[PDB]
Amino acid sequence: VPIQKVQDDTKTLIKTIVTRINDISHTQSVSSKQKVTGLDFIPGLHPILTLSKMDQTLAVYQQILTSMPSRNVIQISNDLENLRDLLHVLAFSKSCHLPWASGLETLDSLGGVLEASGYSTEVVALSRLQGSLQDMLWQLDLSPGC
Amino acid sequence: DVIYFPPKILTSVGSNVSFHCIYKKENKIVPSKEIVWWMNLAEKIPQSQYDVVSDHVSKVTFFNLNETKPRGKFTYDAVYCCNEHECHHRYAELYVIDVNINISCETDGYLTKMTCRWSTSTIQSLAESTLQLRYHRSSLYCSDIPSIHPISEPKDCYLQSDGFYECIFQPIFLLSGYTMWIRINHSLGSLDSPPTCVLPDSVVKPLPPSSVKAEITINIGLLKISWEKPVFPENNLQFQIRYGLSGKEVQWKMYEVYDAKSKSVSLPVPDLCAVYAVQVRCKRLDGLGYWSNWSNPAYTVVMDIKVPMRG
Amino acid sequence: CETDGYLTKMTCRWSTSTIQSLAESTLQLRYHRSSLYCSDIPSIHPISEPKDCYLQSDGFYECIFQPIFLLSGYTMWIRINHSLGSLDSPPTCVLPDSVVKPLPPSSVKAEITINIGLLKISWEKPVFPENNLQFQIRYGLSGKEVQWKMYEVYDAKSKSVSLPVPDLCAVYAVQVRCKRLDGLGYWSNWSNPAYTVVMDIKVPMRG
Ligand SMILES: *[C@@H]1O[C@H](CO[C@@H]2O[C@@H](C)[C@@H](O)[C@@H](O)[C@@H]2O)[C@@H](O[C@@H]2O[C@H](CO)[C@@H](O)[C@H](O)[C@H]2NC(C)=O)[C@H](O)[C@H]1NC(C)=O
Ligand SMILES: *[C@@H]1O[C@H](CO)[C@@H](O)[C@H](O)[C@H]1NC(C)=O
Ligand SMILES: *[C@@H]1O[C@H](CO)[C@@H](O)[C@H](O)[C@H]1NC(C)=O
Ligand SMILES: *[C@@H]1O[C@H](CO)[C@@H](O)[C@H](O)[C@H]1NC(C)=O
Ligand SMILES: *[C@@H]1O[C@H](CO)[C@@H](O)[C@H](O)[C@H]1NC(C)=O
Ligand SMILES: *[C@@H]1O[C@H](CO)[C@@H](O)[C@H](O)[C@H]1NC(C)=O
Numbered sequence: 001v002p003i004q005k006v007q008d009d010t011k012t013l014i015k016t017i018v019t020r021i022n023d024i025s026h027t028q029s030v031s032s033k034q035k036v037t038g039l040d041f042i043p044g045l046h047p048i049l050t051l052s053k054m055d056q057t058l059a060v061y062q063q064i065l066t067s068m069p070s071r072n073v074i075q076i077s078n079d080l081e082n083l084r085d086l087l088h089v090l091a092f093s094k095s096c097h098l099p100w101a102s103g104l105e106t107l108d109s110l111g112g113v114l115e116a117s118g119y120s121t122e123v124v125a126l127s128r129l130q131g132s133l134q135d136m137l138w139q140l141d142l143s144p145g146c
Numbered sequence: 147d148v149i150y151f152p153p154k155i156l157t158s159v160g161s162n163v164s165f166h167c168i169y170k171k172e173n174k175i176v177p178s179k180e181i182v183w184w185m186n187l188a189e190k191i192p193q194s195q196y197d198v199v200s201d202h203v204s205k206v207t208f209f210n211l212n213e214t215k216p217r218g219k220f221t222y223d224a225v226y227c228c229n230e231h232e233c234h235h236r237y238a239e240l241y242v243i244d245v246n247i248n249i250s251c252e253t254d255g256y257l258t259k260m261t262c263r264w265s266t267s268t269i270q271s272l273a274e275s276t277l278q279l280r281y282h283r284s285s286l287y288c289s290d291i292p293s294i295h296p297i298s299e300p301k302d303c304y305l306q307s308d309g310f311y312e313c314i315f316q317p318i319f320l321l322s323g324y325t326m327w328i329r330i331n332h333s334l335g336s337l338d339s340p341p342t343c344v345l346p347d348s349v350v351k352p353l354p355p356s357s358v359k360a361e362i363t364i365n366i367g368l369l370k371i372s373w374e375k376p377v378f379p380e381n382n383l384q385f386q387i388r389y390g391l392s393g394k395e396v397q398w399k400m401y402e403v404y405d406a407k408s409k410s411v412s413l414p415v416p417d418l419c420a421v422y423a424v425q426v427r428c429k430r431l432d433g434l435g436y437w438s439n440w441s442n443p444a445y446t447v448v449m450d451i452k453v454p455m456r457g
Numbered sequence: 458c459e460t461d462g463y464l465t466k467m468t469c470r471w472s473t474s475t476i477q478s479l480a481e482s483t484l485q486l487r488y489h490r491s492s493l494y495c496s497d498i499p500s501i502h503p504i505s506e507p508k509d510c511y512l513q514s515d516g517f518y519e520c521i522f523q524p525i526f527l528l529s530g531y532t533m534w535i536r537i538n539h540s541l542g543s544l545d546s547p548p549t550c551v552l553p554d555s556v557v558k559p560l561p562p563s564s565v566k567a568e569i570t571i572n573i574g575l576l577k578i579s580w581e582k583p584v585f586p587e588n589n590l591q592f593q594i595r596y597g598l599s600g601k602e603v604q605w606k607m608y609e610v611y612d613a614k615s616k617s618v619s620l621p622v623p624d625l626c627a628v629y630a631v632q633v634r635c636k637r638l639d640g641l642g643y644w645s646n647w648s649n650p651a652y653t654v655v656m657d658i659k660v661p662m663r664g
Contacts, residue, residue, distance in 0.1 A: 001494060009528055009554070012554075012586070012587055012588055013527060013528060015587035016464065016527065016585070016586070016587050019584060019585070019587060023584075071524070074524055075465070075524055078524060078525075078526050079526075079527060081526075082493070082526055082527060082528045082529060085492060085493050085528075086493065086528065089493060
């Protein structure tokens with residue numbers, strides 16, 4: 001398959017994920033940065049410039065969403081897995097091998113965080129995901145390096 | 147790190163609530179002069195609703211609060227307090243219940259049973275809550291509501307196919323005030339709807355008169371309608387007549403008579419031999435009570451009235 | 458098959474009309490998942506997962522996939538099982554993104570332009586998909602029977618279009634349909650019909 005087709009499919013999936021996130025009633029006006037002190041393991045804030053950190057962020061987001069039983073969350077996780085596969089294919093296309101890296105190993109307190117602020121543990125996280133998704137598109141409009 | 151009190155609030159629509167919060171960060175207690183409040187992390191509460199009660203304790207108040215629509219598995223709103231930009235993840239939950247419910251009771255014509263119904267379509271705000279009736283019996287009929295009566299006892303109702311909870315009162319007293327209300331009753335406490343008093347005589351539904359018969363008067367050109375007054379109620383009241391030329395669809399036109407002691411009325415019709423459908427309703431003058439159902443259709447006979455002028 | 462307009466489910470069927478002549482065998486569906494794309498040179502798959510889905514009244518086996526993945530190819534086939542052996546139908550590879558059925562356009566309006574004499578129609582694109590779309594409009598004079606006329610729009614960014622009509626004192630009915638620009642998809646449903654209003658447009662011509 002041509003690289004242009006892969007990039008177009010990636011952009012279409014990006015826009016579809018953004019639209020799906022925007023349809024959630026919880027995320028109506030939440031912004032995309034925040035300064036929640038108790039939520040710091042969630043990726044965001046500082047920008048991403050490399051494919052390894054970007055895959056790490058995707059894996060962390062997938063692990064964050066794994067702890068939710070909503071159908072929309074499951075669909076978003078599947079779309080994120082497809083996006084990760086597309087990103088891996090794109091990275092391999094540029095002769096830069098990207099090894100498969102899992103999420104953070106010390107996310108146990110995350111569970112505790114949930115039992116403290118489950119609602120929040122969702123809402124801001126979802127918003128942050130959307131924020132990253134926006135930068136997602138921008139990060140593919142500047143021809144990023146390996 | 148941050149403490150809120152009270153943590154659980156259960157209030158009805160239109161009331162006012164207050165919250166307090168104490169915040170600590172970086173091994174230091176932030177002064178209460180820099181505390182700002184957020185609702186659901188979406189809208190910013192104006193400063194004009196803020197209050198200071200201690201050197202490091204904040205206070206917020208809510209005016210004309212609104213119905214909390216459910217969103218997903220969550221069915222409550224979160225209130226946050228924090229300084230400047232950094233805010234803790236802990237939240238205080240607020241519950242709002244629409245307590246107003248319309249309950250409709252009708253007295254049967256026999257003055258023996260009360261048919262009482264009400265709908266539960268307004269309960270969608272918060273589910274899994276107990277709804278229970280409560281009616282207070284008074285020897286004297288209901289009057290201006292002084293206050294909530296401490297004495298109360300319950301009575302159950304069942305659910306039919308229409309989704310409206312229904313229960314029947316029997317026996318009943320003609321001149322006893324039944325001050326009734328509904329109560330929502332949840333793991334967090336209870337809330338009581340505004341009460342209502344119903345006079346048994348006021349909401350009586352008269353039995354529909356039967357045995358109506360219409361005829362065309364001979365050599366008079368008028369319509370004669372005969373029937374008998376219904377047994378219940380025995381008070382004075384007016385009658386409504388609706389008649390037309392019988393068919394698949396009939397163009398009715400109303401008529402009213404306000405004399406209770408009156409038995410029959412006379413009224414000419416342009417047509418001479420036409421089959422007619424005539425119906426009568428029965429209702430008290432002053433407006434109290436409910437309209438009765440339509441009676442059986444009464445038909446006429448086709449037969450010559452008078453001598454033709456032009457042969 | 459195809460995918461729902463909301464991109465939440467993908468549902469299809471096969472035929473058994475001509476196969477009904479050869480009965481007494483058992484039929485079941487096997488599906489296999491690829492990584493990103495279905496295939497380029499298909500080969501026999503040794504691993505498959507049976508799917509249990511029911512039968513519909515009209516004679517077509519309704520079968521529903523949920524949840525699905527937008528950019529993952531499915532290789533599906535049906536196995537015929539006779540009392541003496543088994544056989545496999547030729548496999549078919551399907552991409553759910555290429556069989557998306559868009560929703561009909563919403564909030565379609567039509568009006569006669571003032572002091573212009575042209576009929577203008579406006580519409581809003583559906584939320585899904587997020588790709589370029591083409592529109593086909595169809596309109597005529599309202600009545601028991603209508604001699605409509607088709608028109609096509611090949612611009613995705615366009616939302617309003619004006620066309621001329623011979624008559625200027627009649628009620629017109631307008632409908633719109635949308636499709637993927639690349640052609641990898643099906644046709645949508647016809648939009649909600651919109652009826653214009655009867656009113657003056659220009660000054661009287663002659664006394
Ligand atoms: C809840 O509080 C309101 C007060 O709202 C405001 O209160 C002040 C801060 C000031 O800004 C007022 O102008 C606002 O109305 C109560 O509304 C008033 O309550 C008083 C006390 O009973 C009454 O005399 C007024 O008539 C009320 N105002 C109106 C327009 O009717 C309201 O009653 C409180 N809720 C409950 C359940 O008591
Ligand atoms: C409740 O909703 C109504 C809807 O118009 C609005 O006018 C009112 O301001 C709302 N109340 C609050 C406290 O936001
Ligand atoms: C209503 O709630 C009260 C708690 O105040 C409880 O005692 C009572 O049993 C409840 N009624 C029910 C469960 O019917
Ligand atoms: C009598 O009238 C009431 C109110 O119009 C209606 O609900 C009821 O069904 C009627 N009774 C019959 C037997 O139709
Ligand atoms: C094929 O059909 C025969 C019927 O004799 C049955 O015994 C066998 O189990 C079937 N094979 C499979 C894989 O279902
Ligand atoms: C589309 O039109 C068909 C008519 O064949 C109808 O069955 C279907 O429900 C319609 N779908 C939508 C989303 O309007």
